Amino acid sequence: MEFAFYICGLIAILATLRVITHTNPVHALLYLIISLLAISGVFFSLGAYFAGALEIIVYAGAIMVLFVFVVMMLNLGGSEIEQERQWLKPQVWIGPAILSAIMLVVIVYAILGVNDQGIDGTPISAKAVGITLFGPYVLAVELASMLLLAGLVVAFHVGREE
Amino acid sequence: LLKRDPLNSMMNIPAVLSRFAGKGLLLSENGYLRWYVASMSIGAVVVLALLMVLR
Amino acid sequence: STEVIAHHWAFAIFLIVAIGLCCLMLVGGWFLGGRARLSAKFYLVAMFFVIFDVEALYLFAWSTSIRESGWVGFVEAAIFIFVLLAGLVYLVRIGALDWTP
Amino acid sequence: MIPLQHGLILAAILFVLGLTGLVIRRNLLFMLIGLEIMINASALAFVVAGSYWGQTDGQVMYILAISLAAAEASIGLALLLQLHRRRQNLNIDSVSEMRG
Amino acid sequence: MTITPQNLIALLPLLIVGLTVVVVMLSIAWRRNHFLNATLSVIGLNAALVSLWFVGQAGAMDVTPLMRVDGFAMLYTGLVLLASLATCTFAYPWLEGYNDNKDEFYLLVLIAALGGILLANANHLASLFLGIELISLPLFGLVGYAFRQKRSLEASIKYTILSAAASSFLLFGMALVYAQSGDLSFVALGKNLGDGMLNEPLLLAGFGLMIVGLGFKLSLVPFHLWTPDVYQGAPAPVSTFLATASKIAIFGVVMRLFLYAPVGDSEAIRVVLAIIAFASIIFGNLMALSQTNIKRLLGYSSISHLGYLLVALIALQTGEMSMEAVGVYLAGYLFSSLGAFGVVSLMSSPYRSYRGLFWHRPILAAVMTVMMLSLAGIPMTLGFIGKFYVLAVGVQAHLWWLVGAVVVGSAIGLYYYLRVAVSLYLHAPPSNWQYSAGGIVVLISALLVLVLGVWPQPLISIVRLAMPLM
Numbered sequence: 069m070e071f072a073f074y075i076c077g078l079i080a081i082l083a084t085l086r087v088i089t090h091t092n093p094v095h096a097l098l099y100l101i102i103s104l105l106a107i108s109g110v111f112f113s114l115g116a117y118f119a120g121a122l123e124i125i126v127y128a129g130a131i132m133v134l135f136v137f138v139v140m141m142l143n144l145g146g147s148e149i150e151q152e153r154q155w156l157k158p159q160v161w162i163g164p165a166i167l168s169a170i171m172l173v174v175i176v177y178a179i180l181g182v183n184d185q186g187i188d189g190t191p192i193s194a195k196a197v198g199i200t201l202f203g204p205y206v207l208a209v210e211l212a213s214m215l216l217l218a219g220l221v222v223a224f225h226v227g228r229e230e
Numbered sequence: 231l232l233k234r235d236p237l238n239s240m241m242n243i244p245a246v247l248s249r250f251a252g253k254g255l256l257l258s259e260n261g262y263l264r265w266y267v268a269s270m271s272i273g274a275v276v277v278l279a280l281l282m283v284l285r
Numbered sequence: 286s287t288e289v290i291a292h293h294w295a296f297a298i299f300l301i302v303a304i305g306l307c308c309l310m311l312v313g314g315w316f317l318g319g320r321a322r323l324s325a326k327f328y329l330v331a332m333f334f335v336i337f338d339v340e341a342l343y344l345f346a347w348s349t350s351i352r353e354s355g356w357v358g359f360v361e362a363a364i365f366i367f368v369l370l371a372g373l374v375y376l377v378r379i380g381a382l383d384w385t386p
Numbered sequence: 387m388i389p390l391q392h393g394l395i396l397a398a399i400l401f402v403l404g405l406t407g408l409v410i411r412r413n414l415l416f417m418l419i420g421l422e423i424m425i426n427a428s429a430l431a432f433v434v435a436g437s438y439w440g441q442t443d444g445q446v447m448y449i450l451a452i453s454l455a456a457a458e459a460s461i462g463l464a465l466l467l468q469l470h471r472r473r474q475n476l477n478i479d480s481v482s483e484m485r486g
Numbered sequence: 487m488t489i490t491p492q493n494l495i496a497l498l499p500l501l502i503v504g505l506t507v508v509v510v511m512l513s514i515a516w517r518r519n520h521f522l523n524a525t526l527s528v529i530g531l532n533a534a535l536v537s538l539w540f541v542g543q544a545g546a547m548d549v550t551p552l553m554r555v556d557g558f559a560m561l562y563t564g565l566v567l568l569a570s571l572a573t574c575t576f577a578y579p580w581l582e583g584y585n586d587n588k589d590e591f592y593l594l595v596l597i598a599a600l601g602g603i604l605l606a607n608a609n610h611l612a613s614l615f616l617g618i619e620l621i622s623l624p625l626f627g628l629v630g631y632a633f634r635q636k637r638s639l640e641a642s643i644k645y646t647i648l649s650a651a652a653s654s655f656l657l658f659g660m661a662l663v664y665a666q667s668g669d670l671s672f673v674a675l676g677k678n679l680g681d682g683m684l685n686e687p688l689l690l691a692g693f694g695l696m697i698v699g700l701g702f703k704l705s706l707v708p709f710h711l712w713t714p715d716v717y718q719g720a721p722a723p724v725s726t727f728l729a730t731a732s733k734i735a736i737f738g739v740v741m742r743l744f745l746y747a748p749v750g751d752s753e754a755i756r757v758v759l760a761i762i763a764f765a766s767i768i769f770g771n772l773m774a775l776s777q778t779n780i781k782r783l784l785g786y787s788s789i790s791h792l793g794y795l796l797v798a799l800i801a802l803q804t805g806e807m808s809m810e811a812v813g814v815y816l817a818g819y820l821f822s823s824l825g826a827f828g829v830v831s832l833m834s835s836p837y838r839s840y841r842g843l844f845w846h847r848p849i850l851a852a853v854m855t856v857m858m859l860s861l862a863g864i865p866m867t868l869g870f871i872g873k874f875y876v877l878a879v880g881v882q883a884h885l886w887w888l889v890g891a892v893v894v895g896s897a898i899g900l901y902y903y904l905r906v907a908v909s910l911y912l913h914a915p916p917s918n919w920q921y922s923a924g925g926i927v928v929l930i931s932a933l934l935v936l937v938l939g940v941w942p943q944p945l946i947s948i949v950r951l952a953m954p955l956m
């Protein structure tokens with residue numbers, strides 16, 4: 069259980085590093101899909117089975133499908149902005165690298181001082197999540213439906229062809 | 231010597247300081263989205279580090 | 286429980302043997318034998334699929350625990366499904382889901 | 387047996403990687419990719435926190451998070467399509483006409 | 487917690503607004519009618535405003551673990567409702583100049599108002615996050631409603647990218663806070679710490695990430711650079727909405743979160759918020775000396791006024807009338823921004839220079855200089871009453887740096903407000919009842935600001951009626 073957790077975490081970190089440093093949009097999206105499968109592995113190793121199921125169903129099966137769809141629609145290939153590799157020049161990324169580094173080490177040092185009895189990996193079933201979703205969190209469900217409807221209307225209005 | 235009103239200039243000092251500081255602060259609003267995200271992350275590090283050093 | 290770890294191992298070898306079988310099938314195919322602008326309706330369809338798939342996942346979470354949620358859960362999901370159907374009727378009527386001109 | 391700290395570190399690493407990809411990339415698609423990476427990292431942290439306490443609230447806010455991520459990705463890709471439709475390029479430095 | 491019929495009675499504005507979205511959407515599905523859908527939207531918002539009386543008769547109670555209805559729930563719900571109604575009233579003559587579809591505007595305004603009511607009644611991290619997203623995403627649509635424009639599309643892109651970044655920051659903050667605390671209720675954020683261990687590193691880190699996200703949402707320095715571009719590029723009714731309703735709802739849920747959380751009286755968070763308040767006041771006054779754009783000027787004005795509100799928030803635990811001061815300031819700021827952006831919308835309507843405005847539009851120029859005097863803290867205005875409240879709360883907790891920042895920022899803001907107010911009267915080289923309705927709205931805001939500056943007692947009593955569960 070734990071070994072799968074560390075292996076999938078390492079795979080997700082390496083895949084994310086490949087996404088943020090790649091030049092092909094399709095290869096970057098494929099590496100992101102690999103990272104999302106790894107993150108679903110993290111979800112399954114902790115007992116949150118519903119979380120990993122929805123990670124592969126709607127995150128690694130719907131949203132990145134939409135990204136791949138718009139990539140093949142836009143015909144992204146040998147463009148001018150892609151050929152120069154401006155994000156790989158060290159003078160460009162050296163500032164954001166140390167910025168993300170100091171943010172990361174501050175967050176790490178804040179995390180490391182917290183109490184921890186460990187995660188038992190007890191499987192929180194999707195039945196309990198369904199009970200709580202329509203239990204204490206009913207207005208979250210209705211207004212998240214309203215949020216998805218708002219995003220639907222906004223993206224339709226922006227994304228028409230006319 | 232006094233006909234140029236030196237005390238009026240000594241009290242007009244903060245007006246020119248305010249204009250210079252405002253023109254300097256307007257350099258951050260260059261209209262670049264990547265700089266805006268970078269400034270948000272810079273503020274995140276500043277706020278975080280200030281919270282841990284004063285914890 | 287040896288049955289649970291046995292089923293986990295069965296799933297592991299099922300995954301490994303399936304992926305490796307496809308790999309060696311491609312390898313054997315390569316090895317053997319001699320040699321000598323798209324419209325925005327695509328985006329709209331994918332977007333509608335994504336939004337209705339998230340609302341579908343909400344209904345997925347509902348349907349597994351219908352009995353213990355009671356009739357209050359039923360009327361909540363009735364408002365949910367009515368909102369979904371209202372949005373669907375709205376999308377159909379304006380021509381968002383009309384591919385033909 | 388799995389520390390809460392290790393999952394939090396993994397989520398923080400994914401978050402800062404997505405933020406770096408959001409900052410250094412001036413193509414709008416990679417900025418949106420970085421945005422989904424950060425929101426998925428925060429959702430992963432929330433799932434880790436929920437699984438530490440044995441509560442379903444982490445998965446519930448994960449569901450809300452992925453609903454937001456789906457709708458926001460839809461809106462961002464519609465805006466990207468509009469930008470590529472009217473300007474024929476995805477340079478995020480080209481949208482700088484409002485300044486001062 | 488389950489739902490009782492009296493709990494349904496406590497949620498009349500939410501259910502009425504959601505039913506209004508459903509009804510307006512089904513009406514657009516029937517036929518695209520601009521007048522009918524706008525009338526249905528304003529009818530639903532007015533029905534929610536009327537049903538606030540029944541919510542007040544119901545009393546204060548907690549509906550689900552998510553939400554709690556009390557005095558500021560009603561107050562912020564009402565403020566968001568007036569902001570949304572004024573936004574629709576200003577948007578209608580502007581939308582007569584729109585060649586494309588106009589009916590989705592009111593749908594997005596209704597959904598954003600629904601998120602505002604969420605943020606008004608929020609008592610939970612889930613409701614807070616959902617309300618912020620429910621405000622942001624319709625604002626993504628409304629800012630880029632005229633996406634054929636470079637300015638509106640660019641502002642929509644900037645706001646969408648930056649608000650997704652801030653939402654991820656805020657969500658990571660709640661994740662860290664939930665990892666430390668184990669409860670997402672407002673009252674339990676820090677209830678597991680005692681004997682002076684309130685400055686937990688992970689709790690402070692998560693709350694700092696929330697400060698990052700909310701300071702983006704409240705245009706606080708240094709998460710403020712989006713404000714002038716988004717304010718300038720968006721349509722003027724939309725700019726009115728982000729000026730009034732979004733800021734009011736997000737600051738109300740921030741005030742409730744800092745009042746109810748035991749970590750809200752931490753010294754480190756107090757010092758960080760003091761630094762942010764000082765910097766926001768000084769910066770939002772300093773970048774607006776040399777603005778020839780009225781909308782960017784009002785964006786920096788919003789930055790400085792949210793800094794003043796933050797100054798009022800910092801003394802919440804030490805002071806006793808800090809929340810009353812916040813309510814009075816938010817009401818006065820709502821009316822001043824409503825009038826100013828309504829005048830901006832009326833000269834921006836229909837869709838297709840404030841100098842010399844008095845010689846062709848004298849009533850609009852007069853109400854505009856009245857609202858500019860209100861934003862400067864000039865007496866006989868409600869903004870002066872808000873500034874007086876903020877100063878009194880500053881002397882309550884001895885926040886002398888913040889008080890001096892208030893003085894110097896008031897002087898600088900007063901300088902550029904007088905520039906606009908007298909440039910209205912210099913010399914420089916409609917015809918429907920909805921335009922007259924928008925003019926009536928800005929005129930009523932002007933008379934309200936003048937009367938409640940001269941006689942502020944009714945508003946003070948109304949705000950003092952809004953007390954929470956102790």
Ligand SMILES: CCCCCCCCCCCCCCCCCC(=O)OC[C@H](COP(=O)(O)OCCN)OC(=O)CCCCCCCCCCCCCCCCC
Binds near residue numbers: 112
């Ligand atoms: C071999 C070295 C590495 C080789 C290269 C990488 C290959 C892929 C590595 C990742 C996927 C496999 C990880 C190893 C899983 C081994 C099985 C395991 O750990 O089972 C334990 C546990 C069983 O479930 P549970 O009921 O919790 O039992 C606890 C025991 N009492 O399991 C769990 O609780 C959860 C098990 C993991 C989650 C399900 C499977 C997720 C798969 C994700 C794949 C992602 C993409 C990988 C791409 C690799 C190439 C780039």
Ligand SMILES: CCCCCCCCCCCCCCCCCC(=O)OC[C@H](COP(=O)(O)OCCN)OC(=O)CCCCCCCCCCCCCCCCC
Binds near residue numbers: 540544545560561
């Ligand atoms: C086209 C159609 C047009 C229709 C008209 C539209 C415009 C008019 C809209 C009218 C809205 C009415 C809102 C009424 C709110 C107050 C309701 C009420 O009766 O509250 C009473 C309650 C305290 O009463 P009590 O019974 O003692 O409670 C103890 C019980 N536990 O009190 C409370 O609990 C708190 C009371 C105050 C709550 C805030 C008030 C509402 C929001 C006001 C926003 C504007 C404020 C600034 C302007 C002020 C002008 C004077």
Ligand SMILES: CCCCCCCCCCCCCCCCCC(=O)OC[C@H](COP(=O)(O)OCCN)OC(=O)CCCCCCCCCCCCCCCCC
Binds near residue numbers: 242248249775898901
């Ligand atoms: C006894 C000292 C201690 C007590 C002090 C109490 C405060 C009140 C008494 C002092 C007031 C000083 C005011 C100084 C500025 C007066 C206004 C002025 O001169 O405005 C005009 C000037 C622009 O004029 P021009 O030269 O044409 O610039 C071209 C612009 N495009 O405009 C500008 O340059 C911009 C003006 C910005 C706003 C005015 C400056 C406010 C600065 C803070 C004042 C508060 C006190 C600070 C400390 C004072 C010294 C200790």
